[PDB]
């Protein structure tokens, strides 16, 4: 399906995805598209910080579900 | 028509390495970082508007995970002794420090505030998990030993370890995909200003790397003092990282939702300027 | 000329060099940014091991090329 990863700047990222995928896989997809390491990514949906272990099936999802992306940049 | 600046000198690192000054002159310049931050208008914008102010150049950054700590040594000599010592001191201050209770309040309050911007609301367990993660990053567990890279709050703790202010020159946005949180001013607020170094440690951040900022004359050891402005190119005051401390009487659940309570702890401009003038020599120039 | 030095787990090192630079000159730069003494450095480019006494041009290191550092 198609989901949207929204950042604090307002940039919308259209990502290919499936309910079988987990948050770890989504962060891996973001890394392939934005170059941001998964450990420096925090995916938030509906006000909850998603866990890497749990899948997209664990939480709710749709063909228009928008996720929030927060970064923990490291130097 | 007047901006606040700070006349700083390079740290006296004699007791750690008596030939440290020589390592500064010997050191490379991070040309990649210099060009990036200059063309972004974050570095050396002040030279044109403020005469009698030298250009700041980034020293060589590292790739072993201790670039932040390595910047406090301003030389090659840090690599196999000090850089790891400072990292260990960083870890210790977070775990068994005497001001760790207050440092945690400053961290959580700012994190709670920034969490609103995404609609994020941490559970009491998630707060415990995030704090443990910060300390884990400051550990000396490898994976040529490579150490974990450090976050924004670790810079704030470093200011307490060095007992000196830290001014970071960096971009505000990531090439605009996401905000860059490192730029701004870091004050050792849990340490009495009288017991701190007056001159701040001026750093630069670019592409997940930290570097010390020096003037050309400070590198060749021909002039002790240089100038760092406490505002951006648009003359807006730099962010004060983790400056707000809500106090022990701050109930995290209720008070965070209370707008009146938040207003009572949110710093004004007058308070911000007082804090800056307490830990740094702030000179206003036209 | 700008080149890169990658390691197995460390950050990517960016160097400003010249085609006429010797391997000793590069190792002296890597030592400044990695803390590894030159004699303990093994540099690899395109499957070739960069030996001292030679230059980057002898291995045809181009602009934006990437060396691989290993002990």
From Swiss-Prot, chain A:
According to the entry, every stretch annotated as the Ubiquitin-like domain falls at 1-75
Impact noted for substituting residue 68 to G: Loss of DTX3L-mediated polyubiquitination of histone H3 and H4
Its record classes its membrane topology as: Peripheral membrane protein
Annotated disulfide bonds: none
Question: Which ranges form a coiled coil?
Answer: none
Residue intervals passing through the bilayer: none
Q: How does the record describe the protein's post-translational processing?
A: Phosphorylated at Ser-65 by PINK1 during mitophagy. Phosphorylated ubiquitin specifically binds and activates parkin (PRKN), triggering mitophagy. Phosphorylation does not affect E1-mediated E2 charging of ubiquitin but affects discharging of E2 enzymes to form polyubiquitin chains. It also affects deubiquitination by deubiquitinase enzymes such as USP30. Mono-ADP-ribosylated at the C-terminus by PARP9, a component of the PPAR9-DTX3L complex. ADP-ribosylation requires processing by E1 and E2 enzymes and prevents ubiquitin conjugation to substrates such as histones.
Phosphoserine modified-residue sites: 65
Reported effect, residue 63 to R: Abolishes HLTF-mediated polyubiquitination of PCNA
Which residues are recorded with the post-translational modification (Microbial infection) ADP-ribosylthreonine? Answer: 66
Site positions (Essential for function): 68
Per the UniProt record, the site (Interacts with activating enzyme) maps to 54, 72
- Mutagenesis / variant outcome for changing residue 65 to A: Prevents phosphorylation in case of mitophagy. Decreased localization of PRKN to mitochondria
Q: Where is this cross-link: Glycyl lysine isopeptide (Lys-Gly) (interchain with G-Cter in ubiquitin)?
A: 6, 11, 27, 29, 33, 48, 63
> What's the effect of swapping residue 72 to G?
No effect on ADP-ribosylation
Subcellular location(s): the record lists: Cytoplasm; Nucleus; Mitochondrion outer membrane
Cited function:
Exists either covalently attached to another protein, or free (unanchored). When covalently bound, it is conjugated to target proteins via an isopeptide bond either as a monomer (monoubiquitin), a polymer linked via different Lys residues of the ubiquitin (polyubiquitin chains) or a linear polymer linked via the initiator Met of the ubiquitin (linear polyubiquitin chains).
UniProt protein name: Ubiquitin
Source organism (scientific name): Homo sapiens
Q: Which gene encodes it?
A: UBB
Q: Which residues of the full protein are shown?
A: 1 to 75 of 229
Swiss-Prot record, chain B:
Tell me how this protein assembles: Interacts with ZAP70 in activated T cells, but not in resting T cells. Interacts with TRAF3. Interacts with TRAF6. Interacts with PARK7, leading to inhibit deubiquitinase activity. Interacts with EGFR, ITCH and NEDD4.
Give residue numbers for the site Stabilizes the conformation of the regulatory loop. Answer: 70
What's an example of a GO molecular-function annotation for this chain? K48-linked deubiquitinase activity
The reported effect of residue 209 to N is:
Loss of deubiquitinating activity
Of the intact sequence, the residues represented are 128 to 435 of 843
Which is a Gene Ontology cellular component entry for this protein? nucleus
Found, by tissue, as follows:
Widely expressed. Abundant in kidney, heart and fetal liver. Expressed differentially among B-cells at distinct developmental stages. Higher expression seen in primary immature B-cells as compared to the mature cells.
Regulatory loop: region residues? 60-66
Task: Give the top-rank taxon of the lineage listed in the UniProt record for this protein.
Answer: Eukaryota
What's the reported outcome of changing residue 70 to A/E?
Strongly reduces deubiquitinating activity
Give the organism's phylogenetic lineage: Eukaryota, Metazoa, Chordata, Craniata, Vertebrata
Q: What is this protein called?
A: OTU domain-containing protein 7B
Q: Which GO terms describe its biological process?
A: adaptive immune response; in utero embryonic development; mucosal immune response; negative regulation of canonical NF-kappaB signal transduction; negative regulation of interleukin-8 production; negative regulation of protein localization to nucleus; negative regulation of TORC1 signaling; negative regulation of transcription by RNA polymerase II
* Function as written in the Swiss-Prot or TrEMBL entry: Negative regulator of the non-canonical NF-kappa-B pathway that acts by mediating deubiquitination of TRAF3, an inhibitor of the NF-kappa-B pathway, thereby acting as a negative regulator of B-cell responses. In response to non-canonical NF-kappa-B stimuli, deubiquitinates 'Lys-48'-linked polyubiquitin chains of TRAF3, preventing TRAF3 proteolysis and over-activation of non-canonical NF-kappa-B. Negatively regulates mucosal immunity against infections. Deubiquitinates ZAP70, and thereby regulates T cell receptor (TCR) signaling that leads to the activation of NF-kappa-B.
Q: Which UniProt keywords apply?
A: Adaptive immunity, Cytoplasm, Hydrolase, Immunity, Metal-binding, Nucleus, Phosphoprotein, Protease, Thiol protease, Ubl conjugation pathway, Zinc, Zinc-finger
State the residue spans of region: TRAF-binding. 25-252
Q: Where in or outside the cell is it found?
A: Cytoplasm; Nucleus
Give the active-site positions: 64, 67 (nucleophile), 209 (proton acceptor)
Q: According to the record, what induces this protein's expression?
A: By TNF-alpha.
């Amino acid at each position: 399906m198609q989901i949207f990863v929204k950042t604090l700047t307002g940039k919308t990222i259209t990502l290919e995805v499936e309910p079988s995928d987990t948050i770890e896989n989504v962060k891996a997809k973001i890394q392939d598209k934005e170059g941001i390491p998964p450990d420096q990514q925090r995916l938030i949906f509906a006000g909850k910080q998603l866990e890497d272990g749990r899948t997209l099936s664990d939480y709710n999802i749709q063909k228009e579900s928008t996720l929030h992306l927060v970064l923990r940049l490291r130097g | 028509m007047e901006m606040p600046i700070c006349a700083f000198q390079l740290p006296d690192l004699t007791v750690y390495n008596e030939d440290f000054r020589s390592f500064i002159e010997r050191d490379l310049i991070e040309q990649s970082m210099l060009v990036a931050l200059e063309q972004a208008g974050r570095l050396n914008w002040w030279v044109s508007v403020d005469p009698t102010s030298q250009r700041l150049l980034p020293l060589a950054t590292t790739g072993d995970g201790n670039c932040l700590l390595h910047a406090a040594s301003l030389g090659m000599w840090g690599f196999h002794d000090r850089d790891l010592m400072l990292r260990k001191a960083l870890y210790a201050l977070m775990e068994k420090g005497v001001e760790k209770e207050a440092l945690k309040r400053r961290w959580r309050w700012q994190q709670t505030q920034q969490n609103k911007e995404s609609g994020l609301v941490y559970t009491e367990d998630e707060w415990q998990k995030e704090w443990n993660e910060l300390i884990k990053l400051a550990s000396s567990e490898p994976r040529e030993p490579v150490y974990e890279s450090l976050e924004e709050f670790h810079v704030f703790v470093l200011a307490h370890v060095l007992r000196r202010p830290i001014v970071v020159v960096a971009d505000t946005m990531l090439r605009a995909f996401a905000p860059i949180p490192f730029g701004g001013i870091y004050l050792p607020l849990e340490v009495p200003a009288s017991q701190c170094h007056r001159s701040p440690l001026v750093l630069a951040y670019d592409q997940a790397h930290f570097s010390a900022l020096v003037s050309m004359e400070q590198k060749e050891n021909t002039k002790e003092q240089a100038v760092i402005p406490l505002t951006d190119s648009e003359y807006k005051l730099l962010p004060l990282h983790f400056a707000v401390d809500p106090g022990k009487g701050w109930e995290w659940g209720k008070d965070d939702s209370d707008n009146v309570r938040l207003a009572s702890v949110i710093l004004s401009l007058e308070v911000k300027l007082h804090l800056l003038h307490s830990y740094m020599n702030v000179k206003w120039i036209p």
